[PDB]
Amino acid sequence: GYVPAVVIGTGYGAAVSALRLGEAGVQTLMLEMGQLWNQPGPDGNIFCGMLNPDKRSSWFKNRTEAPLGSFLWLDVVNRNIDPYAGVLDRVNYDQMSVYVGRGVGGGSLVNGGMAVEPKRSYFEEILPRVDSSEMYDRYFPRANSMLRVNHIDTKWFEDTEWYKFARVSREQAGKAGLGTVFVPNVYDFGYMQREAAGEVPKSALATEVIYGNNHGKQSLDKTYLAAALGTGKVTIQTLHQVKTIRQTKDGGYALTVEQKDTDGKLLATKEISCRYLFLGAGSLGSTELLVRARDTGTLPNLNSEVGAGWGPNGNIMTARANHMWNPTGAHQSSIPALGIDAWDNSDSSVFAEIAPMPAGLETWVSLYLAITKNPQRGTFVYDAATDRAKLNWTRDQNAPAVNAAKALFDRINKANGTIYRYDLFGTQLKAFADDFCYHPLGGCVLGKATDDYGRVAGYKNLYVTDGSLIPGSVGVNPFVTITALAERNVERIIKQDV
Ligand SMILES: Cc1cc2nc3c(=O)[nH]c(=O)nc-3n(C[C@H](O)[C@H](O)[C@H](O)COP(=O)(O)OP(=O)(O)OC[C@H]3O[C@@H](n4cnc5c(N)ncnc54)[C@H](O)[C@@H]3O)c2cc1C
């Protein structure tokens, strides 16, 4: 049926948009292809942990997979599973695997919670048409408050066994003249301290994050989406995937929407129409919908920039072997708290998470997720034969990202007399994982596929809200930027258009 506003997806861009629409009195329907994650499963928990993955871990796969970096220790717990509407989707393209969340809350369900504002000078470089003063004065603060960002207690961090891994990398980086920074988070650090004291059920301290956190993590279902539902003007329909978008002959937009069960069986195909249409299906999902609509003729006035300008936020994973005297600990919180900030906006820039590992026994490995500045971009092209967007990215396009990560970690290895691990990402010698992405950015870039507020070029009352807007790189973990930009955009849209 008809609803004034439809929001596709329930990640960061979608959740912000729906809250503000509802507060403005606009009846809004959110369509989410994944589940509402609120049913206790066979272990009594909503989500599986990293040491007990089951079908809940995976979006329609037939075998569980180890978290990247941990195959050597966690393959032993992998099992065959029924294809199911699980929470983490590894989306495989030709030469890149992009990991995304599936469910009410999108990537907020599966992410590490790291809530980081980009460097203002870098923001100004990547988005020169946007007023940076409003962003830093108004929208970034609004996002940090709404997201429930909080900060780890430094004394607890210094003392706890659960962050030994972070302190070891801090010390090693320091010998190379590199400093660390604390990373704010949406995981409640007060709750985490109580986990360590045995006072509340563990989640971060029980090897949970990438398949969801049963406690502690303030994902969007608890923050923006709860508030959106609280307006009385927003509803969310789950296991509903939008397939096609057209402009109706009488104005507005019409969607074909498939309803499935959790086994992926098609239950119904529905037509849903609206006056205002907001895409929050992610870098992958929003871009796919729009390239499909352009190339199948249902939104024929979309421009050539739709599909373009994708990058993986310079994501590279690597690992160092510590000296025997620098164990990283068997007990590592699943939520990172420290990063190495070597980002100066130059091509050598690196901002690297000090990543925990879930093995639960001593391995001496330090793991890092580097964010780099690599100008290479890919393009989503529509394949009409299979009705899918394909991402034209090649592995060699990550060479500059590998080079920057390697130059930084080579400094740390030189200062400490350590070497890389070469065995964490497959049997072939490979110290740098260069074909994954947790932070997909672009495909519907702000100001190129859209105007400076995400209004899709060629169309009225059609908006993109999410990571597809960002031009490939933000230099930090991206969700705070997506959230703040979405706050800016929807406020202007409600004022001028609605
Ligand atoms: C393992 C992992 C760790 C991460 N750690 C961090 C971190 O610590 N900090 C950080 O800043 N970022 C982190 N990220 C990245 C962050 O989660 C994403 O940048 C963010 O979630 C993107 O928000 P979005 O609104 O663009 O889309 P998403 O959050 O991806 O949400 C899109 C939603 O739309 C739904 N959807 C897609 N297509 C359709 C359709 N056709 N119809 C209906 N629904 C649809 C999806 O199922 C999903 O729920 C991490 C990501 C991963 C994979």
PDB file of C-alpha atoms in Angstrom, residues 231-438:
ATOM      1  CA  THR A 231       7.481   9.064  17.729  1.00  0.00           C
ATOM      2  CA  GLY A 232       4.352   7.072  16.893  1.00  0.00           C
ATOM      3  CA  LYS A 233       4.936   7.818  13.193  1.00  0.00           C
ATOM      4  CA  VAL A 234       7.373   5.057  12.206  1.00  0.00           C
ATOM      5  CA  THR A 235       6.964   1.336  11.636  1.00  0.00           C
ATOM      6  CA  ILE A 236       9.464  -1.274  10.540  1.00  0.00           C
ATOM      7  CA  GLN A 237       8.692  -4.327   8.381  1.00  0.00           C
ATOM      8  CA  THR A 238      11.365  -7.005   8.453  1.00  0.00           C
ATOM      9  CA  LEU A 239      12.341  -9.729   6.000  1.00  0.00           C
ATOM     10  CA  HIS A 240      11.167  -7.267   3.312  1.00  0.00           C
ATOM     11  CA  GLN A 241      13.685  -6.611   0.538  1.00  0.00           C
ATOM     12  CA  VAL A 242      13.099  -3.855  -1.977  1.00  0.00           C
ATOM     13  CA  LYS A 243      13.887  -5.089  -5.471  1.00  0.00           C
ATOM     14  CA  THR A 244      12.747  -2.319  -7.846  1.00  0.00           C
ATOM     15  CA  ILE A 245      11.986   1.390  -7.721  1.00  0.00           C
ATOM     16  CA  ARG A 246       9.965   3.347 -10.290  1.00  0.00           C
ATOM     17  CA  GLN A 247       8.404   6.792 -10.482  1.00  0.00           C
ATOM     18  CA  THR A 248       4.611   6.430 -10.547  1.00  0.00           C
ATOM     19  CA  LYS A 249       2.675   8.058 -13.343  1.00  0.00           C
ATOM     20  CA  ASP A 250       0.811  10.133 -10.782  1.00  0.00           C
ATOM     21  CA  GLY A 251       3.886  11.166  -8.835  1.00  0.00           C
ATOM     22  CA  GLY A 252       5.899   9.648  -6.085  1.00  0.00           C
ATOM     23  CA  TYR A 253       7.555   6.241  -6.115  1.00  0.00           C
ATOM     24  CA  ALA A 254       6.466   2.629  -6.262  1.00  0.00           C
ATOM     25  CA  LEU A 255       8.498  -0.296  -4.986  1.00  0.00           C
ATOM     26  CA  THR A 256       8.362  -4.016  -5.561  1.00  0.00           C
ATOM     27  CA  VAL A 257       9.130  -5.656  -2.248  1.00  0.00           C
ATOM     28  CA  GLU A 258       9.721  -9.334  -1.540  1.00  0.00           C
ATOM     29  CA  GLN A 259       8.712 -10.766   1.820  1.00  0.00           C
ATOM     30  CA  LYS A 260      10.634 -13.892   2.809  1.00  0.00           C
ATOM     31  CA  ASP A 261      10.845 -16.193   5.781  1.00  0.00           C
ATOM     32  CA  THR A 262      14.096 -16.789   7.665  1.00  0.00           C
ATOM     33  CA  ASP A 263      14.848 -19.776   5.402  1.00  0.00           C
ATOM     34  CA  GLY A 264      14.706 -17.450   2.394  1.00  0.00           C
ATOM     35  CA  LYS A 265      11.401 -18.769   1.057  1.00  0.00           C
ATOM     36  CA  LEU A 266       9.417 -16.186  -0.881  1.00  0.00           C
ATOM     37  CA  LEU A 267       6.121 -15.529   0.937  1.00  0.00           C
ATOM     38  CA  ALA A 268       4.762 -12.588  -1.058  1.00  0.00           C
ATOM     39  CA  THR A 269       5.672  -9.842  -3.485  1.00  0.00           C
ATOM     40  CA  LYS A 270       4.122  -6.522  -2.561  1.00  0.00           C
ATOM     41  CA  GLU A 271       3.823  -3.153  -4.182  1.00  0.00           C
ATOM     42  CA  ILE A 272       4.460  -0.302  -1.777  1.00  0.00           C
ATOM     43  CA  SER A 273       4.235   3.336  -2.805  1.00  0.00           C
ATOM     44  CA  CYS A 274       5.118   6.673  -1.288  1.00  0.00           C
ATOM     45  CA  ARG A 275       5.576  10.399  -1.734  1.00  0.00           C
ATOM     46  CA  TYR A 276       9.130  10.597  -0.321  1.00  0.00           C
ATOM     47  CA  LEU A 277      11.610   7.763  -0.806  1.00  0.00           C
ATOM     48  CA  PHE A 278      14.805   7.511   1.269  1.00  0.00           C
ATOM     49  CA  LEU A 279      17.493   4.940   0.466  1.00  0.00           C
ATOM     50  CA  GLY A 280      19.429   3.659   3.475  1.00  0.00           C
ATOM     51  CA  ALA A 281      20.357   0.251   2.092  1.00  0.00           C
ATOM     52  CA  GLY A 282      24.094   0.928   2.494  1.00  0.00           C
ATOM     53  CA  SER A 283      26.900   1.602   0.050  1.00  0.00           C
ATOM     54  CA  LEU A 284      26.164  -1.766  -1.568  1.00  0.00           C
ATOM     55  CA  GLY A 285      22.389  -1.871  -1.318  1.00  0.00           C
ATOM     56  CA  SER A 286      21.463   1.681  -2.237  1.00  0.00           C
ATOM     57  CA  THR A 287      23.896   1.736  -5.139  1.00  0.00           C
ATOM     58  CA  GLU A 288      22.580  -1.594  -6.434  1.00  0.00           C
ATOM     59  CA  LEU A 289      18.986  -0.356  -6.351  1.00  0.00           C
ATOM     60  CA  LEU A 290      19.866   2.765  -8.319  1.00  0.00           C
ATOM     61  CA  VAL A 291      22.114   1.151 -10.970  1.00  0.00           C
ATOM     62  CA  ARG A 292      19.381  -1.444 -11.462  1.00  0.00           C
ATOM     63  CA  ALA A 293      16.720   1.256 -11.787  1.00  0.00           C
ATOM     64  CA  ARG A 294      18.806   3.237 -14.274  1.00  0.00           C
ATOM     65  CA  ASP A 295      19.796   0.317 -16.430  1.00  0.00           C
ATOM     66  CA  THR A 296      16.419  -1.466 -16.440  1.00  0.00           C
ATOM     67  CA  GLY A 297      14.664   1.766 -17.340  1.00  0.00           C
ATOM     68  CA  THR A 298      12.581   2.345 -14.216  1.00  0.00           C
ATOM     69  CA  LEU A 299      14.525   5.502 -13.200  1.00  0.00           C
ATOM     70  CA  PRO A 300      15.879   6.426 -16.610  1.00  0.00           C
ATOM     71  CA  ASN A 301      16.915   9.956 -15.615  1.00  0.00           C
ATOM     72  CA  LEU A 302      19.599   8.826 -13.169  1.00  0.00           C
ATOM     73  CA  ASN A 303      23.029  10.141 -14.062  1.00  0.00           C
ATOM     74  CA  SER A 304      26.282   8.458 -14.980  1.00  0.00           C
ATOM     75  CA  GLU A 305      27.751   9.043 -11.504  1.00  0.00           C
ATOM     76  CA  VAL A 306      25.339   6.487 -10.038  1.00  0.00           C
ATOM     77  CA  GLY A 307      27.570   3.472  -9.372  1.00  0.00           C
ATOM     78  CA  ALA A 308      30.844   5.425  -9.330  1.00  0.00           C
ATOM     79  CA  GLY A 309      33.362   6.403  -6.731  1.00  0.00           C
ATOM     80  CA  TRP A 310      33.424   3.365  -4.473  1.00  0.00           C
ATOM     81  CA  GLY A 311      36.294   2.679  -2.131  1.00  0.00           C
ATOM     82  CA  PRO A 312      36.900   0.410   0.861  1.00  0.00           C
ATOM     83  CA  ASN A 313      37.992   3.205   3.242  1.00  0.00           C
ATOM     84  CA  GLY A 314      41.539   2.053   2.565  1.00  0.00           C
ATOM     85  CA  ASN A 315      40.915  -1.040   4.724  1.00  0.00           C
ATOM     86  CA  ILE A 316      43.918  -3.383   5.142  1.00  0.00           C
ATOM     87  CA  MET A 317      44.454  -6.009   7.854  1.00  0.00           C
ATOM     88  CA  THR A 318      47.892  -7.055   9.076  1.00  0.00           C
ATOM     89  CA  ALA A 319      49.536  -8.692  12.055  1.00  0.00           C
ATOM     90  CA  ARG A 320      52.835  -8.750  13.910  1.00  0.00           C
ATOM     91  CA  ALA A 321      54.430 -11.579  15.847  1.00  0.00           C
ATOM     92  CA  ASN A 322      55.393 -10.370  19.311  1.00  0.00           C
ATOM     93  CA  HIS A 323      58.487 -11.342  21.217  1.00  0.00           C
ATOM     94  CA  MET A 324      57.848 -14.155  23.669  1.00  0.00           C
ATOM     95  CA  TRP A 325      58.177 -11.659  26.505  1.00  0.00           C
ATOM     96  CA  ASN A 326      55.265  -9.607  25.116  1.00  0.00           C
ATOM     97  CA  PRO A 327      52.249 -11.931  25.260  1.00  0.00           C
ATOM     98  CA  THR A 328      49.001 -10.259  24.283  1.00  0.00           C
ATOM     99  CA  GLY A 329      46.855 -12.333  26.664  1.00  0.00           C
ATOM    100  CA  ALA A 330      44.321 -15.125  26.387  1.00  0.00           C
ATOM    101  CA  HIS A 331      41.559 -12.722  27.454  1.00  0.00           C
ATOM    102  CA  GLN A 332      41.000  -9.912  24.975  1.00  0.00           C
ATOM    103  CA  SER A 333      37.942  -7.692  24.985  1.00  0.00           C
ATOM    104  CA  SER A 334      36.142  -7.971  21.645  1.00  0.00           C
ATOM    105  CA  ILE A 335      35.699  -4.187  21.548  1.00  0.00           C
ATOM    106  CA  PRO A 336      38.833  -2.268  20.498  1.00  0.00           C
ATOM    107  CA  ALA A 337      39.799   0.688  22.687  1.00  0.00           C
ATOM    108  CA  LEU A 338      43.046   1.996  21.171  1.00  0.00           C
ATOM    109  CA  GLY A 339      44.282   2.981  17.755  1.00  0.00           C
ATOM    110  CA  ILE A 340      47.528   4.169  16.221  1.00  0.00           C
ATOM    111  CA  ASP A 341      46.982   7.634  14.719  1.00  0.00           C
ATOM    112  CA  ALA A 342      49.514   8.237  11.981  1.00  0.00           C
ATOM    113  CA  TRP A 343      47.082  10.141   9.775  1.00  0.00           C
ATOM    114  CA  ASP A 344      48.294  13.538   8.529  1.00  0.00           C
ATOM    115  CA  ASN A 345      46.239  13.652   5.278  1.00  0.00           C
ATOM    116  CA  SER A 346      49.302  12.750   3.206  1.00  0.00           C
ATOM    117  CA  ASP A 347      49.482   9.620   1.077  1.00  0.00           C
ATOM    118  CA  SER A 348      51.396   7.869   3.885  1.00  0.00           C
ATOM    119  CA  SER A 349      48.477   8.330   6.279  1.00  0.00           C
ATOM    120  CA  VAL A 350      47.385   5.416   8.432  1.00  0.00           C
ATOM    121  CA  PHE A 351      44.841   5.260  11.239  1.00  0.00           C
ATOM    122  CA  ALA A 352      45.015   1.714  12.614  1.00  0.00           C
ATOM    123  CA  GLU A 353      42.703  -0.003  15.068  1.00  0.00           C
ATOM    124  CA  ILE A 354      44.600  -2.273  17.534  1.00  0.00           C
ATOM    125  CA  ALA A 355      42.292  -5.240  17.027  1.00  0.00           C
ATOM    126  CA  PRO A 356      41.569  -7.929  19.607  1.00  0.00           C
ATOM    127  CA  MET A 357      41.727 -11.527  18.729  1.00  0.00           C
ATOM    128  CA  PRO A 358      39.223 -14.105  19.899  1.00  0.00           C
ATOM    129  CA  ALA A 359      41.377 -17.264  20.167  1.00  0.00           C
ATOM    130  CA  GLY A 360      41.087 -17.268  23.932  1.00  0.00           C
ATOM    131  CA  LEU A 361      44.622 -18.616  24.370  1.00  0.00           C
ATOM    132  CA  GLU A 362      48.052 -17.029  23.991  1.00  0.00           C
ATOM    133  CA  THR A 363      49.181 -16.562  20.408  1.00  0.00           C
ATOM    134  CA  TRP A 364      51.576 -13.593  20.731  1.00  0.00           C
ATOM    135  CA  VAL A 365      49.841 -12.011  17.711  1.00  0.00           C
ATOM    136  CA  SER A 366      49.016  -8.329  17.445  1.00  0.00           C
ATOM    137  CA  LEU A 367      46.326  -7.660  14.834  1.00  0.00           C
ATOM    138  CA  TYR A 368      45.602  -4.342  13.139  1.00  0.00           C
ATOM    139  CA  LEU A 369      42.907  -2.936  10.868  1.00  0.00           C
ATOM    140  CA  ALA A 370      44.519  -0.068   8.982  1.00  0.00           C
ATOM    141  CA  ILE A 371      42.572   2.774   7.371  1.00  0.00           C
ATOM    142  CA  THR A 372      44.634   4.383   4.600  1.00  0.00           C
ATOM    143  CA  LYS A 373      44.428   7.075   1.912  1.00  0.00           C
ATOM    144  CA  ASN A 374      44.310   5.323  -1.446  1.00  0.00           C
ATOM    145  CA  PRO A 375      42.852   7.282  -4.391  1.00  0.00           C
ATOM    146  CA  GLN A 376      41.766   4.186  -6.322  1.00  0.00           C
ATOM    147  CA  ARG A 377      38.023   3.800  -6.822  1.00  0.00           C
ATOM    148  CA  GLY A 378      35.749   1.122  -8.162  1.00  0.00           C
ATOM    149  CA  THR A 379      32.453   1.227  -9.992  1.00  0.00           C
ATOM    150  CA  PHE A 380      29.288  -0.809  -9.575  1.00  0.00           C
ATOM    151  CA  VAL A 381      28.042  -1.865 -12.955  1.00  0.00           C
ATOM    152  CA  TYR A 382      24.706  -3.508 -13.534  1.00  0.00           C
ATOM    153  CA  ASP A 383      24.619  -7.028 -14.906  1.00  0.00           C
ATOM    154  CA  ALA A 384      21.187  -7.433 -16.449  1.00  0.00           C
ATOM    155  CA  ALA A 385      21.775 -11.142 -16.973  1.00  0.00           C
ATOM    156  CA  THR A 386      21.913 -11.944 -13.240  1.00  0.00           C
ATOM    157  CA  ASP A 387      20.120  -8.763 -12.068  1.00  0.00           C
ATOM    158  CA  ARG A 388      23.001  -7.803  -9.812  1.00  0.00           C
ATOM    159  CA  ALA A 389      25.370  -4.994  -9.360  1.00  0.00           C
ATOM    160  CA  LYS A 390      28.894  -6.099  -9.856  1.00  0.00           C
ATOM    161  CA  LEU A 391      31.773  -4.199  -8.268  1.00  0.00           C
ATOM    162  CA  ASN A 392      34.542  -3.467 -10.711  1.00  0.00           C
ATOM    163  CA  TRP A 393      37.410  -3.371  -8.243  1.00  0.00           C
ATOM    164  CA  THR A 394      40.673  -5.265  -8.779  1.00  0.00           C
ATOM    165  CA  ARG A 395      43.058  -6.355  -6.018  1.00  0.00           C
ATOM    166  CA  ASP A 396      45.910  -4.367  -7.535  1.00  0.00           C
ATOM    167  CA  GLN A 397      43.828  -1.247  -6.826  1.00  0.00           C
ATOM    168  CA  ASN A 398      44.640  -1.826  -3.151  1.00  0.00           C
ATOM    169  CA  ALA A 399      48.394  -1.619  -3.745  1.00  0.00           C
ATOM    170  CA  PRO A 400      48.620   1.965  -2.454  1.00  0.00           C
ATOM    171  CA  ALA A 401      46.722   0.971   0.703  1.00  0.00           C
ATOM    172  CA  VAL A 402      49.007  -2.033   1.267  1.00  0.00           C
ATOM    173  CA  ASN A 403      52.042   0.178   0.636  1.00  0.00           C
ATOM    174  CA  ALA A 404      50.969   2.748   3.227  1.00  0.00           C
ATOM    175  CA  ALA A 405      50.081   0.131   5.838  1.00  0.00           C
ATOM    176  CA  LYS A 406      53.348  -1.708   5.244  1.00  0.00           C
ATOM    177  CA  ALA A 407      55.447   1.453   5.525  1.00  0.00           C
ATOM    178  CA  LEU A 408      53.905   2.206   8.919  1.00  0.00           C
ATOM    179  CA  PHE A 409      54.153  -1.298  10.352  1.00  0.00           C
ATOM    180  CA  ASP A 410      57.663  -1.700   8.923  1.00  0.00           C
ATOM    181  CA  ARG A 411      58.657   1.218  11.178  1.00  0.00           C
ATOM    182  CA  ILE A 412      57.232  -0.642  14.180  1.00  0.00           C
ATOM    183  CA  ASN A 413      58.927  -3.893  13.193  1.00  0.00           C
ATOM    184  CA  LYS A 414      62.273  -2.119  12.695  1.00  0.00           C
ATOM    185  CA  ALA A 415      62.111  -0.404  16.083  1.00  0.00           C
ATOM    186  CA  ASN A 416      61.262  -3.650  17.871  1.00  0.00           C
ATOM    187  CA  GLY A 417      63.084  -6.332  15.914  1.00  0.00           C
ATOM    188  CA  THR A 418      59.820  -8.129  15.134  1.00  0.00           C
ATOM    189  CA  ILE A 419      58.413  -9.626  11.976  1.00  0.00           C
ATOM    190  CA  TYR A 420      54.968  -9.922  10.424  1.00  0.00           C
ATOM    191  CA  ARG A 421      52.809 -12.980  10.557  1.00  0.00           C
ATOM    192  CA  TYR A 422      52.351 -14.369   7.022  1.00  0.00           C
ATOM    193  CA  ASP A 423      49.926 -17.199   7.729  1.00  0.00           C
ATOM    194  CA  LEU A 424      46.755 -15.588   9.107  1.00  0.00           C
ATOM    195  CA  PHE A 425      44.914 -15.021   5.808  1.00  0.00           C
ATOM    196  CA  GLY A 426      45.526 -18.290   3.933  1.00  0.00           C
ATOM    197  CA  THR A 427      48.312 -20.755   3.284  1.00  0.00           C
ATOM    198  CA  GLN A 428      50.109 -18.592   0.728  1.00  0.00           C
ATOM    199  CA  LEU A 429      52.499 -16.142   2.395  1.00  0.00           C
ATOM    200  CA  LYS A 430      50.484 -12.962   2.824  1.00  0.00           C
ATOM    201  CA  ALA A 431      51.045 -10.391   5.563  1.00  0.00           C
ATOM    202  CA  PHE A 432      48.423  -7.876   4.327  1.00  0.00           C
ATOM    203  CA  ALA A 433      44.789  -8.782   3.719  1.00  0.00           C
ATOM    204  CA  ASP A 434      43.864  -6.601   0.776  1.00  0.00           C
ATOM    205  CA  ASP A 435      40.567  -7.969  -0.534  1.00  0.00           C
ATOM    206  CA  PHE A 436      38.110  -7.397   2.276  1.00  0.00           C
ATOM    207  CA  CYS A 437      36.149  -4.354   3.368  1.00  0.00           C
ATOM    208  CA  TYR A 438      34.219  -3.592   6.545  1.00  0.00           C
TER     209      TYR A 438
END
